[PDB]
Amino acid sequence: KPTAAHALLSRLRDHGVGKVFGVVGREAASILFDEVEGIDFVLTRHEFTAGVAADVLARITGRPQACWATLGPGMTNLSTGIATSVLDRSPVIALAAQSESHDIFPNDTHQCLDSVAIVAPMSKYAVELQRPHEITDLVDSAVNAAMTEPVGPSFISLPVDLLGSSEGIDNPPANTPAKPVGVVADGWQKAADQAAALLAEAKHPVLVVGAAAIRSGAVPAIRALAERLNIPVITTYIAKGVLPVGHELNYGAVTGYMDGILNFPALQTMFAPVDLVLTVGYDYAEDLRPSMWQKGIEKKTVRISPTVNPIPRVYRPDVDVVTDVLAFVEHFETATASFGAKQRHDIEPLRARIAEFLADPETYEDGMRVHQVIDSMNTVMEEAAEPGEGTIVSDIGFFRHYGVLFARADQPFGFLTSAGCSSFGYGIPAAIGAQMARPDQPTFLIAGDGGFHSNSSDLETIARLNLPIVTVVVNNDTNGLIELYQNIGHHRSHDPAVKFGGVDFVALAEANGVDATRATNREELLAALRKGAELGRPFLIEVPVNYDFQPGGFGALSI
Amino acid sequence: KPTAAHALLSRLRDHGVGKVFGVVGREAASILFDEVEGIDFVLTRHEFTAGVAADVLARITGRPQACWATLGPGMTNLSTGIATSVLDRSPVIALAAQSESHDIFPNDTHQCLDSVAIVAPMSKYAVELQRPHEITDLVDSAVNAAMTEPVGPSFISLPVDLLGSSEGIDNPPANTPAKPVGVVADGWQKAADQAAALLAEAKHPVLVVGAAAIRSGAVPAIRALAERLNIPVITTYIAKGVLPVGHELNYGAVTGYMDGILNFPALQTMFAPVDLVLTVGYDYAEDLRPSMWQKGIEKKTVRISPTVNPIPRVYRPDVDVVTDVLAFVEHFETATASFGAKQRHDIEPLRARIAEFLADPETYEDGMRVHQVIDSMNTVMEEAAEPGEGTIVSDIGFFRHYGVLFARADQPFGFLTSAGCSSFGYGIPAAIGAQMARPDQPTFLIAGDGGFHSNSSDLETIARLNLPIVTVVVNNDTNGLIELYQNIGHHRSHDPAVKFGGVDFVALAEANGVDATRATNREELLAALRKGAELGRPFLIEVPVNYDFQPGGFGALSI
Amino acid sequence: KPTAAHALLSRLRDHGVGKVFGVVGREAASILFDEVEGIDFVLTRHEFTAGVAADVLARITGRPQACWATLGPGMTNLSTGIATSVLDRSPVIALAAQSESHDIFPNDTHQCLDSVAIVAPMSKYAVELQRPHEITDLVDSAVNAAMTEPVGPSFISLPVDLLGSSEGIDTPNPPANTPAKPVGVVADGWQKAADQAAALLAEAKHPVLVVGAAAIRSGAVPAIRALAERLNIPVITTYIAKGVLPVGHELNYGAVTGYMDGILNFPALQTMFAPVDLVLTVGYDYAEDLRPSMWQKGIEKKTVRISPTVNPIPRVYRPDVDVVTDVLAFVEHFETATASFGAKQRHDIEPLRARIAEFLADPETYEDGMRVHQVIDSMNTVMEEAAEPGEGTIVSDIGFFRHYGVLFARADQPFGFLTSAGCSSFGYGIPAAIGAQMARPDQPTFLIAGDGGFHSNSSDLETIARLNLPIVTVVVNNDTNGLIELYQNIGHHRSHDPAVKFGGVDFVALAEANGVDATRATNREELLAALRKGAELGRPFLIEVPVNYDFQPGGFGALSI
Numbered sequence A, B: 001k002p003t004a005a006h007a008l009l010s011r012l013r014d015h016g017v018g019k020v021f022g023v024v025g026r027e028a029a030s031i032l033f034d035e036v037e038g039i040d041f042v043l044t045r046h047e048f049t050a051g052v053a054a055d056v057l058a059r060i061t062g063r064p065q066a067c068w069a070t071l072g073p074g075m076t077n078l079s080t081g082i083a084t085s086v087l088d089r090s091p092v093i094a095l096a097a098q099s100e101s102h103d104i105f106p107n108d109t110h111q112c113l114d115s116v117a118i119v120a121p122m123s124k125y126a127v128e129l130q131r132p133h134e135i136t137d138l139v140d141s142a143v144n145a146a147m148t149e150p151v152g153p154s155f156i157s158l159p160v161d162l163l164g165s166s167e168g169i170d171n172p173p174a175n176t177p178a179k180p181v182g183v184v185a186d187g188w189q190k191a192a193d194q195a196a197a198l199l200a201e202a203k204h205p206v207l208v209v210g211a212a213a214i215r216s217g218a219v220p221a222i223r224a225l226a227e228r229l230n231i232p233v234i235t236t237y238i239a240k241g242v243l244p245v246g247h248e249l250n251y252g253a254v255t256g257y258m259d260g261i262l263n264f265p266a267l268q269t270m271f272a273p274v275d276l277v278l279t280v281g282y283d284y285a286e287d288l289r290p291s292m293w294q295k296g297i298e299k300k301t302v303r304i305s306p307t308v309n310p311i312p313r314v315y316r317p318d319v320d321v322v323t324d325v326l327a328f329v330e331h332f333e334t335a336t337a338s339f340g341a342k343q344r345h346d347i348e349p350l351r352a353r354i355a356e357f358l359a360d361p362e363t364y365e366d367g368m369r370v371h372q373v374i375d376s377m378n379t380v381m382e383e384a385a386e387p388g389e390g391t392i393v394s395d396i397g398f399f400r401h402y403g404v405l406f407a408r409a410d411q412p413f414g415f416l417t418s419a420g421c422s423s424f425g426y427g428i429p430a431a432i433g434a435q436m437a438r439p440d441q442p443t444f445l446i447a448g449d450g451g452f453h454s455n456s457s458d459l460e461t462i463a464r465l466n467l468p469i470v471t472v473v474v475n476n477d478t479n480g481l482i483e484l485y486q487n488i489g490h491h492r493s494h495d496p497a498v499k500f501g502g503v504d505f506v507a508l509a510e511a512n513g514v515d516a517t518r519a520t521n522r523e524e525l526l527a528a529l530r531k532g533a534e535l536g537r538p539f540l541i542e543v544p545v546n547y548d549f550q551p552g553g554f555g556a557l558s559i
Numbered sequence C: 001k002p003t004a005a006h007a008l009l010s011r012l013r014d015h016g017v018g019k020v021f022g023v024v025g026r027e028a029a030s031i032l033f034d035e036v037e038g039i040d041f042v043l044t045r046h047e048f049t050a051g052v053a054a055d056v057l058a059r060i061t062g063r064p065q066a067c068w069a070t071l072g073p074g075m076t077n078l079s080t081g082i083a084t085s086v087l088d089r090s091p092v093i094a095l096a097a098q099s100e101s102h103d104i105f106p107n108d109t110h111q112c113l114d115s116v117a118i119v120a121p122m123s124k125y126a127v128e129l130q131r132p133h134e135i136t137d138l139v140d141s142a143v144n145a146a147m148t149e150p151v152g153p154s155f156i157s158l159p160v161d162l163l164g165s166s167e168g169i170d171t172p173n174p175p176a177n178t179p180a181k182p183v184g185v186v187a188d189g190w191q192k193a194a195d196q197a198a199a200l201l202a203e204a205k206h207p208v209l210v211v212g213a214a215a216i217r218s219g220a221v222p223a224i225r226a227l228a229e230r231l232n233i234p235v236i237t238t239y240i241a242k243g244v245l246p247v248g249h250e251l252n253y254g255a256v257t258g259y260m261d262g263i264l265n266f267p268a269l270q271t272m273f274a275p276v277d278l279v280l281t282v283g284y285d286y287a288e289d290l291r292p293s294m295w296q297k298g299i300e301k302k303t304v305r306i307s308p309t310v311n312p313i314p315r316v317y318r319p320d321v322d323v324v325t326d327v328l329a330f331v332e333h334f335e336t337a338t339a340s341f342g343a344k345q346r347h348d349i350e351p352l353r354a355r356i357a358e359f360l361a362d363p364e365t366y367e368d369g370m371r372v373h374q375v376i377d378s379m380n381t382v383m384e385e386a387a388e389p390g391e392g393t394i395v396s397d398i399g400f401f402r403h404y405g406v407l408f409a410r411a412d413q414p415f416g417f418l419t420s421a422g423c424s425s426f427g428y429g430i431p432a433a434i435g436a437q438m439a440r441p442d443q444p445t446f447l448i449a450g451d452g453g454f455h456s457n458s459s460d461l462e463t464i465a466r467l468n469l470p471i472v473t474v475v476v477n478n479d480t481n482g483l484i485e486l487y488q489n490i491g492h493h494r495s496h497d498p499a500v501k502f503g504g505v506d507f508v509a510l511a512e513a514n515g516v517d518a519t520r521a522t523n524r525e526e527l528l529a530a531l532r533k534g535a536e537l538g539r540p541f542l543i544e545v546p547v548n549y550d551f552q553p554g555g556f557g558a559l560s561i
């Protein structure tokens, strides 16, 4: 007789789920993961990897995805993946086993924690299964909550006895939302008209585009609007690629680190003459903060979001348009149909400074510089990928902000990083998710030694799934970002809190069954990248780097 | 001017803390970790390692210890270490950064999670700093709650702005408890006297000793009582070693897996003729459950614990003595002073079976058997360690229960594993904690491939701290324990949920700067261990193993 | 077949419970309250009254008591009684119905709230029943947590379907094993700490014992009295610890209230504490609102904290010596440690005693009603006449008048003066008097309440009449939340009537509408006559007294935190 395990997997399948990422515990006595045709288990080395892979697969597909952990520490390990989903915004169904229903005594029963209480504050929905047959409605409610803006994870705790029970089990339509449900304020049309009047008066407007605009399906619409009215497009970290590489209105992504990295007044060049900022699909969690565009002259602001403003302390837009992003753009197109195109502000000196970093021909004594590494990756990505295809993934660290500034993105989600949660070790699972979402496209990963090693064991998973991911590890034997913060705050370093000894990442990758090589200059790196891209197997490249940063140029980070 | 960062580290030092284990994030701008002489930061590759190292150091020293993480994902990563502490019972002060106080918007501000809400359900105490100068009293309250039975972790969330602030900062005695504050019921002496009357009438009593008895400082007292009255001593996993190896009253440790592993009615032999079970320092979390001693004739039970019984559904003792364990033993000595010694029951067939496993001279066609691996470790541990010294640490898996049955423990906490939480990956941080707590004693670690690789990156930490831990990795390319559960529940395996590809742990260890070798039989293993023990540096030994388990023998796991 | 309703009531009876106070809702379909011999339902007009009555019965008996409410708003109404129990410290089992288990959707199902989530922050224990037969073990765990210091309420949520189910219920219960008195925590080396306390006492010229309710719960009253009498150490109390020494005892130095200097226009705190060099806070609890700032007067002092709990407030109270142990255990050890010690010379508080006696004896006739001290003096006189020695209870509701009660009310036994020190909800008076009278069935029970607090919960006058409890109630009426008008003036130096002022309520007529005989009294002579009539009536009685305060907002600096 089919049990709740079968009913659970069946309902996931009904919602389009074909993979469950995770680590299985003793609940394997209740669930094999062969119960339902068309749904396969994906075993990782750590639960964090499972949660993040599901998050990234969910982002790219735009469909709910699923991850799995055992009770107690299984669930707490998964919780960092849950945190990624809640802050980065992805519809994930997170599932964890629990002690037998009659034996649930949190902090007393072996391996028993109060899972729902722990996960509730970091999720859209959290529940414990109580009556086996109800799992079908619990999955539906989890999906419902996961697919409402801000999209996020829903959690179901599964007592082992109930998971293996057929009591009451003997499906209605799933009706999975094709795109996220959102909120809409009465009179948003009048607000959008107010925004249009502001646009009429503005000499130098900009569109600041966040990921929610991509979820709404508004990329083509935003592009046509921008092109018609000659409005520059600036993006958050993961909204890179909403305009093609080389497009005249592609003014790039912003990071608070950019002035410090470029030794150039980048933020002032970008924003100083701007008089109207339209934050299209705005989300504070993406870390493009109002302080970043508040440069030079005073600006009017328009917020467009399928959510009520959660942060009026920080952002009080002149016009708040609470509605679906695509709905807004379509109404805005009509309202601005007869408007003359604007003159856009000059950012050529910034474009020149960026092109200079990328072309940097210098050979340094102490390893490569990260801008040279990314320039090399861009070159090979452009060669390996079809037009409008390919993914560059970045883990977290100082180098990540080089990825934000310099990495090629020729499609929405063509550059992937964690903007909301920013857990180190993000790189491997995100590359797994990306490669699975785009099986015939090249997937490159860049990670630093600190973050990469925090989660490097899942190299084995990459080898086992034979995902042809090309990974570049930039190694300076340091949590480099953190050494920068030490210097910002104290004007000196303290090595015991930031410094490592040597890790041979080439030998590490090969130990996991991943072919690898060391590259120490542009010539060796291009060769290694070209080899990896054509290998038909995963490949890893270790690059020695150094940063030589100055803490004085990073005032934009202050909160 | 000294800030809350200084006040925090100073108060930790006041409470005897000399090390802070963790990973530092952007809060480094507010805290360097050189503010206070006598406290050193111990940088790990993952926050879980930091939390568990502190837990184990706190267990062995009996003093509060400290761990550290950044905001958001740092805190969620640390929470698996916090869960270890809460279920395994150790006084850990867990510290995590938080977003700037005026910018705390959980699930909206970049990396901002509601840390206190997430950690409260799995801690003794959880608070967020609000006024910088109060950090001193918050540390004190954290220590107070951590050092009350059941001992556990206390959590302080630290907004980056407040941590770096000197506002209101211009010490009172710390008065750190020497041993845990315990719960004591009125009339416990009367209950203890009722226990004495039960002992007088009993023909075959046993002492079942848990870790709380060790925390109480009751080991010598319990030994003296057991010897005078000829009462056999049986232990939980980590209470192994309360009697020396070879002691006539050392009846061994219990695990629910023992019948299936030994292919022998082990629980029956241990408990069948027993008529009185005294659970001295009982804790359900340790997973020695009433169903395990409920074999053969009817038994009376006496519970002794410095806590009120949290599980009356499961355990209703005939006599419940709520008091300090040492206080009970001292009162019990007086009440039983004139008692004649008992005739102890015969467990020689069980001792014989255990000895048979250890001496197994066969070289199997596939890998070694885990009992052979442990016998080899025992041999070299006995050679390398002074009498009453040495630590064998076990990670989590099927092999762990072989450790419980077979591993040598010649002192309290001589065999260390995670009995309450049992997170895989526990091995490395526990060995770090153990070696640091016992700097002049040998520390051996056994871990399986599944659990070891979940947290294997902290091999670099072992190399960096130059801790001379000898690690044995028992590799069957499987989450073996989980395949067992598949077979128990379904009478077949499902490889996608349990099977890995090959990892070369020798090459992996060497990539991290740890010398390593492979050993495939007793001779190679003994040679490798003897080399490791004398090396004066960390060493790793990979051993191929197989289980060939029989699912039908594990009925004790269900009840 | 017996259901979980029967099992629940049987387990409560096993733990010695004979009454369940509350208001029943639709869960009556699952529970009648006649299922079990020896346990009766006590119906109130509002759930707050039920929780507080259980709280007070638990305080005086020292044993766990029980209250009941329906789902949703039943539970939220009960929660103010739960808050009373958690802050005032009493072992109460709070029970509330919940939606059918399969229909629990908080904030969506009709009347469905997340009860466990709401009550958990203000309770020792909070759980929802899931498998009917487990109610027995849930009650045991609830009692266990309620009876561990600091004592407080434990809450069980009862889905109506499961409450009415016989699934898995086979009717002999295991032993109840209720703690004999509250369980506490004990620090290793508390004896050494106690010896350090004795060393401080050896050197002290003018030590004092500051005694809180936890000392009473520990059964330490006779032991503390014997210690104080031998060593000539004055005893000072919190509000409900009045009566640990008899009225007139030379070492009975009275209770402390932060309001005392301003009510008396006297340096009362200075007189009480200035020459003291050692303060032993015996069974200390911050919630009782005797704060360190109140004894920190005059010369520098050493402090000893004795409590069956670890210090929860080191920011506020850092004792020189902290003795974490059972209060009785401490006193017995301290007796041995100080056996050789002779008696101290106690400090002189006669000027304060004279001021207090002056208020009580106030012979003035005022144009604008009586004064509260005159009202309390009259109550004291009649209480003394009506009660056997060492007996009687004066109950006080909450308001400005309550602190007159603290200073002036007779207490000739522990809990002889009863008020809410931790929670201090207005309306407390009636349920407390109900609980007190039931706990002490043959003793006089008087209640003083102000018009604001009394009318907040006056409907349970009908309950007093129905239960025929011979409580004598005095309502002191000034048509104002007077305490709040005081705070307006403290903070702003003026009043604002819309926030504090009422129109006229005839409490005599109100009482009679509820079936309680009543009368108005406007001077000492009429009040003494009314009280004497009430005390001998054999029925409840209510007396309305017009009062005014004429307070001085400038004299309440001690209140500042």
Ligand SMILES: Cc1ncc(C[n+]2csc(CCOP(=O)(O)OP(=O)(O)O)c2C)c(N)n1
Residues within 6 Å of the ligand: A396, A397, A398, A399, A400, A422, A423, A424, A447, A448, A449, A450, A451, A452, A476, A478, A479, A480, A481, A482, B023, B024, B025, B026, B070, B073, B074, B077
């Ligand atoms: C779970 C978690 N803990 C701590 C941090 C703080 N942190 C962010 S990135 C990072 C890694 C920095 O080192 P690396 O990956 O080598 O990149 P680098 O800054 O040196 O360029 C750390 C420790 C984090 N981001 N996530």
Ligand SMILES: Cc1ncc(C[n+]2csc(CCOP(=O)(O)OP(=O)(O)O)c2C)c(N)n1
Residues within 6 Å of the ligand: A023, A024, A025, A026, A070, A073, A074, A077, B396, B397, B398, B399, B400, B422, B423, B424, B447, B448, B449, B450, B451, B452, B476, B478, B479, B480, B481, B482
């Ligand atoms: C954090 C966490 N996730 C999942 C589990 C389930 N689990 C327990 S031990 C273990 C490892 C079993 O494999 P291995 O370490 O190789 O030991 P083996 O059973 O093969 O002897 C796993 C996956 C766990 N214990 N902890």
Ligand SMILES: Cc1ncc(C[n+]2csc(CCOP(=O)(O)OP(=O)(O)O)c2C)c(N)n1
Residues within 6 Å of the ligand: C398, C399, C400, C401, C402, C424, C425, C426, C449, C450, C451, C452, C453, C454, C478, C480, C481, C482, C483, C484
């Ligand atoms: C539940 C609750 N709400 C508000 C208060 C604030 N408060 C305390 S006592 C009280 C009553 C004051 O008026 P009254 O009972 O007439 O006594 P008075 O101060 O006039 O002497 C009020 C409103 C309270 N104590 N309890």
Ligand SMILES: [Mg+2]
Residues within 6 Å of the ligand: A397, A448, A449, A450, A474, A475, A476, A477, A478, A479, A480
């Ligand atoms: Mg680095």
Ligand SMILES: [Mg+2]
Residues within 6 Å of the ligand: B397, B448, B449, B450, B474, B475, B476, B477, B478, B479, B480
């Ligand atoms: Mg294995």
Ligand SMILES: [Mg+2]
Residues within 6 Å of the ligand: C399, C450, C451, C452, C476, C477, C478, C479, C480, C481, C482
């Ligand atoms: Mg009034």
